[PDB]
């Protein structure tokens with residue numbers, strides 16, 4: 001035993017699973033707006049000897065030796081990150097160690113706040129992330145709500161936009177120390193100027209969490225949160241198209257009397273929260289950030305925008321209703337209540353024909369436990385060189401699933417009744433097997449980033 | 455642009471840095487006891503298309519579709535985890551999503567404790583981990599000590615062992631809800647049974663954090679904390695030799711029922727983490743299948759012999775070992791009797807391609823410069839080192855120490871020592887000579903992983 005044997009030779013059971021997953025990614029229409037396909041280049045860094053190095057601490061400030069190379073990788077990754085978002089090294093630092101996006105948010109809260117200090121974020125069912133503070137009527141759900149005190153802000157249910165007026169009204173009363181501008185399920189741009197005004201008045205930190213839209217911001221195809229935000233967190237996957245990791249950007253240098261974010265942020269990441277960095281992820285992130293700086297990527301991102309509105313316009317023209325009426329970014333929120341269906345039903349139909357989308361609770365939902373809609377994203381299929389006509393055809397395939405769903409709803413009662421009918425009625429099975437086969441044939445023909453076979 | 459281009463073609467700056475790190479690993483004597491060299495098979499899973507799949511939730515209970523294969527991988531990882539540590543699925547379950555060891559511990563704490571509830575772990579300078587709670591005189595350092603209330607327990611400096619008697623005395627007073635049995639820098643076997651007695655008495659959960667020893671435990675070459683703990687955390691790297699990632703094992707079934715399963719799983723997701731890193735989960739599954747083999751038992755036996763051999767060789771050269779020796783994968787050297795400290799020895803050794811880390815000696819305070827050195831066998835044993843090779847590692851260390859002594863007699867401060875090693879041309883030649891001999895020696899041995907990166 002050397003540990004140089006191949007995966008295919010040494011663990012055939014696992015190799016076959018990697019192949020089935022690769023095949024599933026190739027044959028499918030991936031419409032989850034968080035999802036993307038990482039480059040082979042970055043996957044080579046991720047699957048490297050960099051996994052073997054413990055480098056607790058920071059460049060030049062390590063707790064032990066042998067980190068000279070790993071130091072250059074970290075410092076390179078930082079510079080590439082600041083470059084990717086057109087940030088001045090004098091006015092912005094960045095931490096590249098967070099293990100994912102959720103750790104990155106937790107680290108900011110523990111860096112800047114005391115336990116039980118107050119946080120405001122977009123409510124989860126209005127399109128906020130778990131890590132922005134989310135608790136239910138029964139219990140505290142996100143650890144953000146356990147260790148800190150979160151009150152959500154909300155959508156104006158008329159417009160489907162962020163009710164910025166209520167946020168200002170309500171932040172005056174709640175007195176948050178930190179307010180979060182960022183979304184998991186929101187088709188429009190965030191008014192970061194208006195967020196900073198609220199934050200300036202109530203004397204809160206503004207945290208922009210651009211996870212979903214970080215690629216679009218780097219490419220400069222939407223306006224940048226960095227103009228108005230103190231702190232920016234993000235994933236390195238999603239629209240940045242990297243390996244799974246996280247980043248924390250923070251302002252540094254002179255405020256008005258210096259900013260004091262850098263030392264607090266870095267300390268919270270290590271030694272407070274994390275152990276050894278995942279230097280392999282850091283390197284794959286650096287690879288992906290270089291790719292993000294190129295004109296290729298600006299074109300990718302522009303196509304992401306165009307593909308999204310092509311999907312929107314297409315859905316409007318098949319008569320579907322959209323939350324907020326459309327999109328200014330990489331996704332579309334489809335309200336299926338005005339079509340006489342819901343998200344739960346649509347999802348399971350779409351799934352069975354290799355179309356993968358996300359449920360979305362919409363403003364107009366009459367039932368709190370059945371989501372009304374669906375999030376549909378461009379980035380993943382755009383990375384497979386999809387264009388407007390290809391997304392029109394995606395929308396076309398979706399419409400068939402919806403229409404099966406509508407037909408199965410009137411021949412069923414409950415939601416578990418719905419899902420069993422999809423499996424056991426031969427006439428429904430066959431129409432599903434047919435649509436699936438046509439979807440997989442359509443999808444397979446497009447190129448796919450990464451390795452050929454895993 | 456396809457995203458199918460190779461790394462060497464598309465990003466030569468990064469590919470050159472990967473190649474330097476690979477050469478550094480190949481030419482060095484890696485003695486950091488938490489280090490190991492991950493198999494190629496596992497790294498192929500790590501750098502894979504499994505990076506591309508969001509699968510928030512758990513097998514059969516995901517928040518969205520497309521997870522048929524990812525469910526199978528996660529479920530397979532769980533089966534192999536329970537297999538590696540010889541656990542009955544009726545009595546034990548396992549969560550495979552923690553992003554690393556430190557996340558695994560925070561998730562256990564948020565599952566079982568309220569904010570500000572009480573925790574006890576081995577003090578950091580006595581050999582515990584940051585995540586077991588750590589505060590200086592001046593401030594709270596570990597998040598474990600911010601969100602929870604940490605009080606450490608200590609070694610008996612007389613024996614270098616954990617003072618189980620003072621733990622029992624002091625836990626009766628402090629009333630911890632959770633006590634941690636596990637170490638970063640400790641050469642001996644933990645008396646888990648005694649930890650369990652103290653826990654039962656004060657009505658506290660016993661957590662074994664076995665990160666350093668997990669592979670030894672898997673191979674059944676040391677006693678298993680699973681006989682006595684309710685919860686067991688571990689890294690998947692270190693002695694398990696997998697990708698960086700974490701595990702939380704927990705009791706289930708009866709004694710009426712255990713309530714860890716749902717609380718642990720919920721703490722991991724949705725409370726703390728987001729989407730799991732399925733690529734790491736697959737790498738971990740690969741390393742766990744390796745961990746069940748007779749090969750791995752032979753490896754883990756060898757790690758013990760190699761550490762023994764390193765200890766005996768150090769003793770025969772007149773070095774002091776904290777606790778007198780070792781029953782595990784590492785040895786703790788006390789260099790004060792020799793006239794040198796850990797900070798000096800660490801830096802000399804680093805320059806001759808031997809990586810170790812400094813270690814506070816029992817009875818000293820963090821403020822005094824650490825008197826010792828932590829030396830581990832797992833990494834080099836993965837490169838097929840045997841007992842004679844570790845004797846030879848100790849020869850090289852002895853030269854390093856002997857140089858450090860000469861430089862100490864010619865320098866005043868520590869910063870003085872450190873730039874005398876660089877600028878004084880006679881000692882830098884003596885170092886360059888040793889470095890080359892060390893690197894020659896080390897390069898001969900095989901290395902797990904890919905050839906060039």
Ligand SMILES: Nc1nc(=O)c2c([nH]1)NC[C@H](CCc1ccc(C(=O)N[C@@H](CCC(=O)O)C(=O)O)cc1)C2
Nearest residue numbers: 124125127128129130131136141184185510517724
């Ligand atoms: N906008 C948005 N942000 C997000 O972070 C996520 C999404 N959507 N969608 C998918 C996933 C879901 C997160 C998530 C998990 C649990 C509960 C929850 O309410 N759990 C309670 C009560 C459930 C019930 O009423 O039956 C529980 O204790 O089980 C809510 C949301 C993550």
Ligand SMILES: Nc1nc(=O)c2c([nH]1)NC[C@H](CCc1ccc(C(=O)N[C@@H](CCC(=O)O)C(=O)O)cc1)C2
Nearest residue numbers: 056063271578579581582583584585590595638639
């Ligand atoms: N046994 C053990 N467990 C561990 O988890 C680690 C080790 N050793 N060794 C390396 C690293 C050590 C982490 C670590 C971090 C901060 C301080 C600390 O005391 N910080 C104070 C004052 C220190 C000083 O005066 O230099 C501060 O400045 O906030 C100590 C140790 C991780």
Ligand SMILES: *Cc1c(COP(=O)(O)O)cnc(C)c1O
Nearest residue numbers: 100101102129183184211728729
């Ligand atoms: C997806 C996301 C995150 C982080 O998710 P991880 O799975 O932890 O990487 C954080 N914030 C927002 C707004 C997100 O959409």
Ligand SMILES: *Cc1c(COP(=O)(O)O)cnc(C)c1O
Nearest residue numbers: 275276554555556583637638665
């Ligand atoms: C190394 C270690 C950890 C943490 O592992 P990371 O992957 O560095 O977060 C936790 N506990 C113990 C006992 C360890 O040795």
Ligand code: NA
Nearest residue numbers: 039041459464
């Ligand atoms: Na590329």
